Amino acid sequence: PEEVDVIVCGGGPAGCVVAGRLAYADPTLKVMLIEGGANNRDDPWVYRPGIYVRNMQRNGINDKATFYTDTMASSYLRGRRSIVPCANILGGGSSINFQMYTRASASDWDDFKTEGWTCKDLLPLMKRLENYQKPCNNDTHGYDGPIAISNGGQIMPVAQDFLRAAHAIGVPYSDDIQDLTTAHGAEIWAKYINRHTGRRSDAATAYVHSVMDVQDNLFLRCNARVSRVLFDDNNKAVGVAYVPSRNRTHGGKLHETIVKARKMVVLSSGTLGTPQILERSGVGNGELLRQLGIKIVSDLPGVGEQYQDHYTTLSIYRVSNESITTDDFLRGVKDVQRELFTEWEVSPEKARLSSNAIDAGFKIRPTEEELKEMGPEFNELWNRYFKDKPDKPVMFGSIVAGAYADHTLLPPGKYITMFQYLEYPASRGKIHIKSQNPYVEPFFDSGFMNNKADFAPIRWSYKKTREVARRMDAFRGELTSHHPRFHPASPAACKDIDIETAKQIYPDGLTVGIHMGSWHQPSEPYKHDKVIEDIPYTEEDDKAIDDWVADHVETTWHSLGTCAMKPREQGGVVDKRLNVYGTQNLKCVDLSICPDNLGTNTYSSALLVGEKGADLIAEELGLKIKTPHAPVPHAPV
Amino acid sequence: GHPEEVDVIVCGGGPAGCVVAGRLAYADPTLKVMLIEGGANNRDDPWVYRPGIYVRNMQRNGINDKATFYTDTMASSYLRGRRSIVPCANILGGGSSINFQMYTRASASDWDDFKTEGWTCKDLLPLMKRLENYQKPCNNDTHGYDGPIAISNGGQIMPVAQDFLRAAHAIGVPYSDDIQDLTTAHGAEIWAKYINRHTGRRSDAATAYVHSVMDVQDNLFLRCNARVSRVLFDDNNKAVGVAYVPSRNRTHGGKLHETIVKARKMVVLSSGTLGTPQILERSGVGNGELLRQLGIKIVSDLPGVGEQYQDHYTTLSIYRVSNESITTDDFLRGVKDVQRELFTEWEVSPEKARLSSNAIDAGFKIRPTEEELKEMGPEFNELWNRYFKDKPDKPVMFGSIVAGAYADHTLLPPGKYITMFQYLEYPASRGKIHIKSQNPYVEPFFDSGFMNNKADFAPIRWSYKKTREVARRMDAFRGELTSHHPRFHPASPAACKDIDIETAKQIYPDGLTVGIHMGSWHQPSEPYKHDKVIEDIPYTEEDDKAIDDWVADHVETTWHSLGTCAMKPREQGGVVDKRLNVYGTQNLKCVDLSICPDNLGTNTYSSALLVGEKGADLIAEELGLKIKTPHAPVPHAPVPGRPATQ
Ligand SMILES: Cc1cc2nc3c(=O)[nH]c(=O)nc-3n(C[C@H](O)[C@H](O)[C@H](O)COP(=O)(O)OP(=O)(O)OC[C@H]3O[C@@H](n4cnc5c(N)ncnc54)[C@H](O)[C@@H]3O)c2cc1C
Numbered sequence A: 001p002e003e004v005d006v007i008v009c010g011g012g013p014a015g016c017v018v019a020g021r022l023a024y025a026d027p028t029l030k031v032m033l034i035e036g037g038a039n040n041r042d043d044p045w046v047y048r049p050g051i052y053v054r055n056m057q058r059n060g061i062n063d064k065a066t067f068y069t070d071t072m073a074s075s076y077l078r079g080r081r082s083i084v085p086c087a088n089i090l091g092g093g094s095s096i097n098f099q100m101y102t103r104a105s106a107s108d109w110d111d112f113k114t115e116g117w118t119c120k121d122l123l124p125l126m127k128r129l130e131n132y133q134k135p136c137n138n139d140t141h142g143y144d145g146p147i148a149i150s151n152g153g154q155i156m157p158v159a160q161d162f163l164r165a166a167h168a169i170g171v172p173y174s175d176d177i178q179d180l181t182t183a184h185g186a187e188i189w190a191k192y193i194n195r196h197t198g199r200r201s202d203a204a205t206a207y208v209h210s211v212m213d214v215q216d217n218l219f220l221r222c223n224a225r226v227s228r229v230l231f232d233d234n235n236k237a238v239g240v241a242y243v244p245s246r247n248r249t250h251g252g253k254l255h256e257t258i259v260k261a262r263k264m265v266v267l268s269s270g271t272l273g274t275p276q277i278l279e280r281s282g283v284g285n286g287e288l289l290r291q292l293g294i295k296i297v298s299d300l301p302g303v304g305e306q307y308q309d310h311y312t313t314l315s316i317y318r319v320s321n322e323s324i325t326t327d328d329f330l331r332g333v334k335d336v337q338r339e340l341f342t343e344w345e346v347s348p349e350k351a352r353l354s355s356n357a358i359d360a361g362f363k364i365r366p367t368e369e370e371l372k373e374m375g376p377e378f379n380e381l382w383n384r385y386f387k388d389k390p391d392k393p394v395m396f397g398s399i400v401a402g403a404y405a406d407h408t409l410l411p412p413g414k415y416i417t418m419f420q421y422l423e424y425p426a427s428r429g430k431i432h433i434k435s436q437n438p439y440v441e442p443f444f445d446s447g448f449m450n451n452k453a454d455f456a457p458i459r460w461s462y463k464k465t466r467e468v469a470r471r472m473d474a475f476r477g478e479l480t481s482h483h484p485r486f487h488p489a490s491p492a493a494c495k496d497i498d499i500e501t502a503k504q505i506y507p508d509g510l511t512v513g514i515h516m517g518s519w520h521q522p523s524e525p526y527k528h529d530k531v532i533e534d535i536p537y538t539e540e541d542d543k544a545i546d547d548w549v550a551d552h553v554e555t556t557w558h559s560l561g562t563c564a565m566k567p568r569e570q571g572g573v574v575d576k577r578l579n580v581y582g583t584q585n586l587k588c589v590d591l592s593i594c595p596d597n598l599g600t601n602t603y604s605s606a607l608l609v610g611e612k613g614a615d616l617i618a619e620e621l622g623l624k625i626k627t628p629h630a631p632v633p634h635a636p637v
Numbered sequence B: 001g002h003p004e005e006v007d008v009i010v011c012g013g014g015p016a017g018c019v020v021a022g023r024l025a026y027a028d029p030t031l032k033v034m035l036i037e038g039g040a041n042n043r044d045d046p047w048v049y050r051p052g053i054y055v056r057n058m059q060r061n062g063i064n065d066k067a068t069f070y071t072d073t074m075a076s077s078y079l080r081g082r083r084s085i086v087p088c089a090n091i092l093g094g095g096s097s098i099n100f101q102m103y104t105r106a107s108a109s110d111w112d113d114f115k116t117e118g119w120t121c122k123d124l125l126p127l128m129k130r131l132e133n134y135q136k137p138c139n140n141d142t143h144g145y146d147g148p149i150a151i152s153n154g155g156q157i158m159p160v161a162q163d164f165l166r167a168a169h170a171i172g173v174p175y176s177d178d179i180q181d182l183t184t185a186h187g188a189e190i191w192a193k194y195i196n197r198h199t200g201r202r203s204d205a206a207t208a209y210v211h212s213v214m215d216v217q218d219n220l221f222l223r224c225n226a227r228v229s230r231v232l233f234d235d236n237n238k239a240v241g242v243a244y245v246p247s248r249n250r251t252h253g254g255k256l257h258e259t260i261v262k263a264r265k266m267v268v269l270s271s272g273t274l275g276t277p278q279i280l281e282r283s284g285v286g287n288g289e290l291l292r293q294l295g296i297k298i299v300s301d302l303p304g305v306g307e308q309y310q311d312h313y314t315t316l317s318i319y320r321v322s323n324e325s326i327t328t329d330d331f332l333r334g335v336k337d338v339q340r341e342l343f344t345e346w347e348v349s350p351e352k353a354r355l356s357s358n359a360i361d362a363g364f365k366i367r368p369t370e371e372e373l374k375e376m377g378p379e380f381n382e383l384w385n386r387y388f389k390d391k392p393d394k395p396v397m398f399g400s401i402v403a404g405a406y407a408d409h410t411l412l413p414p415g416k417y418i419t420m421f422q423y424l425e426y427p428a429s430r431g432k433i434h435i436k437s438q439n440p441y442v443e444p445f446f447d448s449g450f451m452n453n454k455a456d457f458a459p460i461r462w463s464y465k466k467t468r469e470v471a472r473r474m475d476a477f478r479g480e481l482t483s484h485h486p487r488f489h490p491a492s493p494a495a496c497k498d499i500d501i502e503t504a505k506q507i508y509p510d511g512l513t514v515g516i517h518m519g520s521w522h523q524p525s526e527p528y529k530h531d532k533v534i535e536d537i538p539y540t541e542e543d544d545k546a547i548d549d550w551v552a553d554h555v556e557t558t559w560h561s562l563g564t565c566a567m568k569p570r571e572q573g574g575v576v577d578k579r580l581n582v583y584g585t586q587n588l589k590c591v592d593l594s595i596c597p598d599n600l601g602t603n604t605y606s607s608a609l610l611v612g613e614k615g616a617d618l619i620a621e622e623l624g625l626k627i628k629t630p631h632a633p634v635p636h637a638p639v640p641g642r643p644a645t646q
């Protein structure tokens, strides 16, 4: 058509819930979901979980991601221009992400300090979205929601190996680290995978294609980049203008098509996308819009400010050749890939590919002792933010059964990577547009490590995750190339592959065991007997780690906080009901609205914001949300 | 044994024929009905029920026997001296056993324009829903959900589909959830298939209407491999039965081996646009001068028997694509382990399998602007005013991306391809088919009649340019296949650009021959740049004339034959009643697409079924039978009666 009731802009977790719930709640209500990227419906490069890694390739084929590079270099990162991707496909992150089922701790929601948003307030909505298909010992999960959650088809022998090691350095085992209370414990790590079908638990098939298969009131435009919201003379959002995904017209001319809104315009276009739409619509910092030739609808300085992410570091460790890992599949060995593709088709329920291979991990929190060696600047964050907040973790740590790094830069053999990220950083960034044009790259700043308090925890994490690695059965060495630049004589210096493992990789190789060049100090072969003591570290080694953090820290795609929800005088952008200040009929509901960070992989969060926004809109339209939701394609119920 | 007498005899087991015999046999288990089909039985044959191998059925290779080839008796000045080949189906299920399985529906006005009571759109709307089991989302209530024939997006949509839509948006053809809503003249969709979403099997009419009934009742008789010669008549021109001969003429002395089977109540003719007129003519029902010259005793003088042969007119614009693109070419080539990988996939999981598609996964119906109408000349403008002007639901051209070449790969270079499959919705040009002898094995006179009306050139020309602009904007695009494109002057800015160097080297990394200019046989395209600004190919009068030549050289049938036994009054050369009775006879109907008095803007499987549904209703009431809903459950399908997921 040209006109409908609710327009949802962006087809991410949040957007898919809003559009899907409202369209099901009332079949009269015409809602249209507009998404920049492509439709994901029945795409074997979405619904199969194991091929997740490739959606982060800058290979000029991958069209499922937009890559946001920093405008200028950062001193704090020793001169590098940070890259932050995000989804360009229906589903958003849910079509391309690691599928790690994590949840925030309880206090995180209370620290929003906003009525409607306590843990207490959201707990029932949390249960409403979840389809929990694994055991636990608490009452904290839901069992008839759309989003299937499990340990997946098969757990890799390294998972329990990681756990055995975590126990040995005094992290306790728990059945569920996602019970809203835990900050220091270790688990088998669940996925957004259906235990029964082997399929990825995307938001689009759960909430949108579910509804489109049974009713005719839900409209979908994919390959459609929403330029701006259309405004009234009294600032009521009337409609929405989108352009084609490609800029491939005659003479590169703009081609806007307009769609009009009777009731609501919803901005679910992501932490990076949403502030851009608001800013080119005329809703942002007044100084910026003036210069850009944009008439001011509302003057909001915090639009596109306070960029919060999680700060990833990837410690990589060499493992035994008998170890089962993803590396040969990731390199694209032919009949490795044929085997796992065939195994998934025949038996999704036991298939290796029905997993993300991130099968174990922990949330961690430092000791009275450990806090002494983490510097003054972090201790000030601790006393203020953490000290009397026992349910908040400081670092995340998981085991990927394979290298998560360009294998074109990795030696042969088997790897595991320790996937770490900083939970509540103090650093902050920003994103502003440089034009009315919706094809120009915007100004961008990661803001990674611009606060000094963020080094001490990551450094701590490096030494900790390493003490685990060294205590595992599968461990053979540290990939020197991808590790800190310790001094060769420091006791903390790396030790690379041992000779027995090397010889196994190239049994007829002429180069194995040639000392010439002294490029590594090899490990002594594996002894199951070996007694192990913690690696000592000097102030020198601690500089080396910091330097390593500044050169190799990255985004975790856990982007939030650019349209913050807090009072307008503080800088915030939305009401408690997520209305953009000084407009009518306009709400921003996605991770943009977070005023404060969460201790979690953020698919659970984006969904929960999406459930809450559906509640708020539904009681504003006098509509009642159905439970359960429409039956979800390819699922037994 | 088999019966020597029954109630109703349906001659020809196509879509229409299958609806009739099925609906009636299910409507009364006492009613004895015999379906006689010239082709072979299609039941549980993996070269029918797998949608992915459809291409093979048009091979003229000495092996394939699921098609009869009718060639023009005389060269056509209009095609530049070439004799035109039109195949039709030679198998139970007719075209529904061997076609592209593209789900398309006529526009509302097409039916209205028959100008015959009982055949209005709103008259036929319930019968349209009665036959469908629609297995995809759409934002309308135009479809049915408990009919026999399953319709879906198939197992796996190709990445080039959504790419094609992006390019079609870039040139102002709008996206829509459903272009088959009897309403749309201008728009682009993901194109559905006559393929059962859950089983991944071909939704042919024989299994859906006939085999279903034969499983649960004893009163439906099937006689395959039986060419219907002629209709036996009474002294009062009542049809009293039918005589058939073997499919293969391989008897002692090359002799005529006729078996007779009598009909108590009705003889139905459903042998297709090409078949039915011949059966009528060699029975004594057609042009009197022709029948008097051939020594056939005249039953009914109908000059319009085998006149007004219409069709849709196809052109195939072939383009080269990136080597990382997913296409069908290697599978069509017969690369052993590509075939092996795809046959295995469909066996294990038909619900997601690439073979559960036709690979024709996106397209558009298109209508020109006033802007574009000026380009198209006086003889197409006279047609527009006369036919399309105040008929806003009628499209001029159809267009769909095939994810591969639809052409002899023996004549194609290596690499990967896509074709813009294009056809003319409502041609002005008309053809004819008449028999040459009483013998049912001699070839008839034939005349495609393609392009014998100059009005047809201009819209196809406009299609070439329009689909070419769509090609040029795609992510997968790597050039035109010069060899299979119009003969532009090489200095023209409309001249073809063939494969670029980077894509070429990928084809043959260790080839000694890649990059040799010598011969200058192709103007290479410059390598793919994601950023590239594109501008439309400009054309001249000379370029236009090149394309008109290309159209005359390379235009073909779309297998959408209709119109040989037109339903209109006898004094205007019509052949049948508004109840599809053959003028001058009793207890004889035609129910197949031969009856259509005017074209329909659609892939005609939908329309052939609808005429069968209508024919069943007409015969039912004549016999006082009520048609049962839903029909007998369909082999290999699951138990369904409203919109659902999978
Ligand atoms: C590679 C990756 C790995 C991750 N790892 C994990 C993990 O292990 N576990 C976990 O639970 N979560 C993970 N996440 C985090 C989580 O998926 C995201 O935080 C979540 O998807 C946020 O949802 P959103 O709707 O707020 O934004 P998004 O998911 O990014 O969705 C935004 C959507 O809006 C569209 N859009 C942008 N601009 C426009 C426009 N102008 N018009 C129309 N549409 C537009 C985009 O195309 C996109 O589809 C990860 C994310 C990614 C990308």
Ligand SMILES: Cc1cc2nc3c(=O)[nH]c(=O)nc-3n(C[C@H](O)[C@H](O)[C@H](O)COP(=O)(O)OP(=O)(O)OC[C@H]3O[C@@H](n4cnc5c(N)ncnc54)[C@H](O)[C@@H]3O)c2cc1C
Binding pocket: B011, B012, B013, B014, B015, B016, B017, B036, B037, B038, B039, B057, B058, B087, B088, B089, B090, B091, B092, B093, B094, B095, B096, B098, B099, B100, B101, B102, B103, B104, B226, B227, B228, B229, B270, B271, B272, B273, B275, B276, B279, B558, B559, B560, B561, B592, B593, B594, B603, B604, B605, B606, B608
């Ligand atoms: C290769 C191909 C591609 C096509 N593409 C599409 C598409 O993508 N989508 C779509 O919707 N439609 C398509 N069509 C068109 C569609 O299949 C036909 O319009 C439809 O099958 C016509 O049905 P019918 O009953 O009118 O005649 P037919 O389907 O031709 O059936 C006639 C039957 O009569 C039999 N017969 C003929 N003469 C005699 C005789 N003397 N005695 C006994 N039996 C006889 C034949 O064996 C045949 O089985 C295509 C057809 C073909 C062949």
